[PDB]
A paper describes a structure:
Human [name] (hGal-7) is a 15 kDa prototype galectin with a single CRD, monomeric but capable of dimerization in solution. Consequently [name] has shown major roles in cancer development, by helping either in the elimination of certain tumour types or in the growth stimulation of others.
The native protein does not show any major conformational change upon binding to the inhibitor 6 with an rmsd of 0.9 Å (all atoms). The amido group also shows potential interactions with water molecules linked to Lys64 and Trp69, broadening the binding capacity of the ligand to a region not previously involved for galactoside recognition by [name]. Interestingly, His33 and Glu122 are not conserved among galectins, thus focusing the ligand interaction towards this position could offer better specificity of inhibition. The anomeric sulfur atom can only weakly interact with a water molecule (3.5 Å) stabilized by Arg31. Interestingly, the benzyl moiety of the O-benzylphosphate 6 is not taking part in the inhibitor binding and faces away from the protein surface. This symmetry-related molecule is unique to molecule B of the asymmetric unit and may also explain why only partial electron density was visible for the ligand of molecule A.
Residue numbers in the entry: 4 to 135
Write the structure that this text describes.
């Protein structure tokens, strides 16, 4: 798993660019926007492409409890193909862009101000996480 500290946190206008490869026969992977470094800390966003079930799940986690899942329109990821994702913070939520297309808007469930860390985990071969 990859961890990126957010020394200025995430503000409206902060862009996370995540580049990587979905390996052959990948099951699923995730990008988490976390509210602490501790194992089990709250997730403001859990972005979860599931290649094995052909879904992309969006959710939040508070005090160890998951919220209600949102699902994106289709799966803009392929086993054996590289990807580029933008997670863009606005005042009203996160915009997920995949490749050259706006994909999903996730309304804030936790305060933006609480986000401290970006974690990338699961069956993905990460190239880079950049914060702009
Ligand atoms: C599929 S249900 C649940 O959906 C959630 C979004 O609403 C999350 O995607 C959650 N995933 C996770 O909690 C998770 C954590 C770490 C890693 C490396 C991979 C996955 C995921 O939990 P998990 O995949 O552990 O649940 C299935 C399960 C539960 C108990 C025993 C076996 C499998």
């Amino acid at each position: 798993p990859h961890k990126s500290s957010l020394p200025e946190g995430i503000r409206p206008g902060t862009v996370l660019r995540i580049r990587g490869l979905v390996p052959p026969n990948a099951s699923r992977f995730h990008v988490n926007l976390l509210c602490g470094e501790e194992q089990g800390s709250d997730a403001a966003l859990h972005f979860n492409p599931r290649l094995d079930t052909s879904e992309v799940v969006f959710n939040s986690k508070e005090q160890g409890s998951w919220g209600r899942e949102e699902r994106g329109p289709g799966v803009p990821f392929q086993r054996g193909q590289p990807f580029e994702v933008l997670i863009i913070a606005s005042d009203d939520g996160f915009k997920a862009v995949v490749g050259d297309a706006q994909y999903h808007h996730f309304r804030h469930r936790l305060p933006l101000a609480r986000v401290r860390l970006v974690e990338v985990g699961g069956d993905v071969q990460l190239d880079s996480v950049r914060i702009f």
